Design a protein around this nucleic acid. Structure first.
Ligand SMILES: [Mg+2]
Ligand SMILES: [Mg+2]
Ligand SMILES: [Mg+2]
Ligand SMILES: [Mg+2]
Ligand SMILES: [Mg+2]
Ligand SMILES: [Mg+2]
Ligand SMILES: [Mg+2]
Ligand SMILES: [Mg+2]
Ligand SMILES: [Mg+2]
Lengths: 106, 151, 110, 209, 59
RNA sequence: AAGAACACCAACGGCGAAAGCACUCUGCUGGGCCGACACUGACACUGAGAGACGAAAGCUAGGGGAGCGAAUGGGAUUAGAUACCCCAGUAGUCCUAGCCGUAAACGAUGGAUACUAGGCGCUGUGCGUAUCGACCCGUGCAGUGUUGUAGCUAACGCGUUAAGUAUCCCGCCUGGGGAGUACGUUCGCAAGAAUGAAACUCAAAGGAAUUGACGGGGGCCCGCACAAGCGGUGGAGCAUGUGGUUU
């Protein structure tokens, strides 16, 4: 809790039901190490189908800057928007847990 | 750096007193790249020290560096174990410049009319035991003897 | 006699006569150290000095040191005992030697 | 050579043995000395070019002088790979090496700097170390002689690859199946070398006519 | 019940006593055997240990 | 006073069908090797069923219980810690009767026999030379290890102790998952062991080796990478860009 959030309509408009789905996922992965991070960067995109040529694909780029010189870069691609958000959140929880295991190595 | 062979700089001396200690003392005063103003801060100070003490200011300056110089310090290390601060000795040149920072550092902090007065009262007080820079020597020297064991 | 027990967490120094009746003692903990600083070799020097200094005043120039166990302070304690005003005959180490007697603990994982 | 060094391959060509040391057979080789000198004498009459491969320190200069008596070729230093097999690269280095001796005659060394002249000096010096006895070959030999099998193991294999008969070191160190012509007893000393080397080099002289 | 003895009475130096004490106890191997007997070791560790000791002494 | 276990000797080591057997002796007792001039006269090999032995763990009674230690508590590390760490600690670990009959019970390699280059050194027991005091040296036999030729092998590697060349006999496999599961049967005090499917489902699963990438693997080195120093940003006010909202 007490962490800001940044969305970005790269190639589309950000709806409200989508915004609720974003906060639900990263809210789980970040609530664990909530006292290490201050902000959450997000950038949603869309391509293909009716917009462009090729398969419909929606990207979700997520960057995270902790309170102690921590940098995370996560980028995945899926056929739907929610599925893209889900896969990235799993990657953040993996690397975000990797940091504590190194700090708590003793 | 990774070379380990730093060139030895040409330690110069002032025109009047012709000693290299004074020139090392001046180079820490300026911060915008001007030397003509530091002497107006210095030559007014050493004259003011002579006005008060009735003796050469050179010995008073040589005594202050002799008293504030700790010749020992503590550095943090965690190559073995977590959060260790064991002592470490200091050379002759390193301890010399190390005392200049503490003197001029305390002079800027303490109140006064000008840097010449703030610097004059610092050296005169620092030479006579009681000085804000001498307190930092005691604090740094305390941490060494406190953590005298290598742990 | 000067029984000394070395270890990684502490170093003990007990003085006693040949008959086995202690007169004085002091360890790194009594000196002021605590935690991991006790096992350091410097603590053995200061701990040994405070225990033997009172003994040199009360005569008994003769002495025998009985080392017991490993540690970093066992060698540093000799410098403390040697840097003194007493002679010595034995520098023997009365350590245990089990011939496969009991079961030791399990190995540590961390 | 010894109880811990005798190869079971030479067992047909062993007669007896002694305290530690080994005794080679001089009977079977005498037939091959005749077959060798008969083939070398017959081959030299047709005008072929031969080669000798000697790099052992004890017989480095002996093989050098051995080649001056005839119009054959020697290899004093190491084999450096692909001498005969990669002949296309060898002609490039020999055409190169042949030219540099003409380069030194010109007065172009004056207009070169100090360091550049040193590289050209050390360049030609390196090729002289390995390309000395080949300067007048101009082609591939037809028979190649091996003085040492162990130290020059690479030279014996390119002959088998290119299909060239050869002479070998059939003493107990090596394998006799590698060369068709077999002459043991050459690892003893220069006596075993010069007695055989001068004998075979001698036969080349009358064969040359 | 002892393991090592040094009957010095007046050494020529303060630090040279360790030369007579360390190397003497080293040949007896008191430090290595106590580290061994601290934690239990299986038959696998014994074979690996004694094998490394031999390879260290042989060459 | 008690219980349990035997440093050093100790390995490139010995014995045993394996599992396994190491502080010392003594008793009873099994097996192997060699020698030779007593003898037997193919009385051999393998082995379905069956039978015996069979690490630890665990079970059924009776004893014992020092130390160590599942479980269970407590103190810490952690977002959490029913874990790793630390302090205490039950069953069990030990003995005598018996059950259980499973392990990476591995040399991941069934047994017997004949043939097939060598090099090193370790035992056991002979022969001969020799100092004939043993030793040493040289060889035979039966074993035990390490390199390695031919040959085999997908490759790694095996290689006179074969994973080579051949014969005889037993067991065993026929894509993966479902599954060593379900039903039934036999044994077992139980825990569970052995025997052992099908429906349905995928077009793979898997082996060796190569190349990169990666590693809280190792070694070395470099950059204002850190450290050290000097001066700023983040706060204030105002330039000016982007988002967002608004239009
Ligand atoms: Mg059966
Ligand atoms: Mg049991
Ligand atoms: Mg099984
Ligand atoms: Mg086993
Ligand atoms: Mg099996
Ligand atoms: Mg088997
Ligand atoms: Mg092999
Ligand atoms: Mg593989
Ligand atoms: Mg820095």
């Amino acid at each position: 809790s007490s962490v800001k959030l940044i969305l970005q309509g790269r190639n589309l408009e950000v709806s409200d039901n989508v915004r609720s789905h974003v906060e639900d996922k990263v809210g789980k992965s970040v609530a664990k190490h909530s006292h290490l991070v201050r902000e959450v960067d997000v950038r949603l995109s869309a391509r293909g189908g009716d917009l462009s040529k090729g398969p419909k694909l929606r990207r979700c780029e997520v960057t995270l800057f902790t309170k102690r010189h921590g940098v995370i870069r996560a980028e995945e691609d899926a056929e739907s928007l929610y599925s893209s958000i889900d896969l990235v959140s799993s990657i953040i929880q993996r690397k975000l847990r990797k940091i504590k295991d190194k700090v708590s190595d003793h | 750096s990774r070379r380990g062979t730093v060139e030895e700089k040409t330690a110069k001396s002032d025109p009047i007193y012709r000693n290299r200690l004074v020139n090392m003392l001046v180079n820490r005063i300026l911060k915008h790249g001007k030397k003509s103003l530091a002497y107006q801060i210095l030559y007014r100070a050493v004259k003011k020290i002579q006005q008060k003490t009735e003796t050469n200011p050179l010995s008073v300056l040589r005594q202050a560096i002799r008293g504030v110089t700790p010749d020992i310090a503590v550095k943090a290390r965690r190559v073995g174990g977590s959060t260790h601060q064991v002592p470490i000795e200091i050379g002759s040149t390193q301890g010399k410049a190390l005392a200049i920072r503490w003197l001029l550092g305390a002079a800027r902090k303490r109140p006064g009319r000008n840097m010449a007065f703030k610097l004059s009262s610092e050296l005169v007080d620092a030479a006579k035991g009681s000085g804000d820079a001498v307190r930092k020597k005691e604090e740094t020297h305390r941490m060494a003897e406190a953590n005298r064991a290598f742990a | 006699v000067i029984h000394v027990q070395a270890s990684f967490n502490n170093t003990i120094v007990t003085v006693t006569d040949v008959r086995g009746r202690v007169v004085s003692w002091a360890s790194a903990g009594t000196c002021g150290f605590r935690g991991t600083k006790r096992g350091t070799p410097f603590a053995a020097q200061t701990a040994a000095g405070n225990a033997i200094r009172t003994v040199v005043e009360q005569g008994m120039q003769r002495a025998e040191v009985m080392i017991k166990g490993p540690g970093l302070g066992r060698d540093a304690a000799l410098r403390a005992i040697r840097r003194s005003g007493i002679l010595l005959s034995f520098v023997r180490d009365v350590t245990p030697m089990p011939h496969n007697g009991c079961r030791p603990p399990k190995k540590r994982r961390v | 050579h010894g109880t811990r060094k005798w190869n079971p391959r030479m067992s047909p060509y062993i007669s007896a043995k002694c305290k530690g040391i080994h005794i080679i057979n001089l009977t079977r080789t005498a037939r091959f000395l005749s077959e060798a000198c008969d083939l070398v004498f017959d081959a030299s009459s047709r005008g072929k070019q031969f080669l000798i491969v000697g790099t052992k320190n004890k017989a480095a200069d002996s093989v050098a002088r051995a080649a001056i008596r005839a119009r054959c070729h020697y290899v004093n230093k190491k084999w450096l790979g692909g001498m005969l097999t990669n002949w296309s690269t060898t002609e490039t280095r020999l055409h190169k090496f042949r030219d540099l001796r003409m380069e030194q005659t010109a007065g172009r060394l004056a207009r070169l700097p100090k360091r550049d002249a040193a590289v050209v000096k050390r360049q030609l010096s390196h090729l002289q170390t390995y390309l000395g006895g080949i300067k007048y070959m101009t082609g591939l030999p037809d028979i190649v002689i091996i003085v040492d099998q162990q130290e020059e193991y690479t030279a014996l294999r390119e002959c088998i690859t290119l299909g060239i008969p050869t002479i070998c070191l059939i003493d107990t160190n090596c394998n006799p199946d590698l060369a068709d012509i077999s002459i043991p007893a050459n690892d003893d000393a220069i006596a075993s070398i010069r007695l055989i080397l001068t004998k075979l080099v001698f036969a080349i002289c009358e064969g040359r006519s | 019940a002892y393991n090592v003895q040094v009957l010095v009475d007046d050494n020529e130096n303060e630090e040279r006593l360790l030369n007579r004490f360390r190397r003497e106890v080293m040949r007896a191997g008191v430090i290595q055997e106590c580290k061994r007997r601290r934690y239990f070791e299986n038959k696998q560790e014994e074979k690996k240990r004694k094998h490394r000791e031999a390879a260290k002494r042989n060459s």
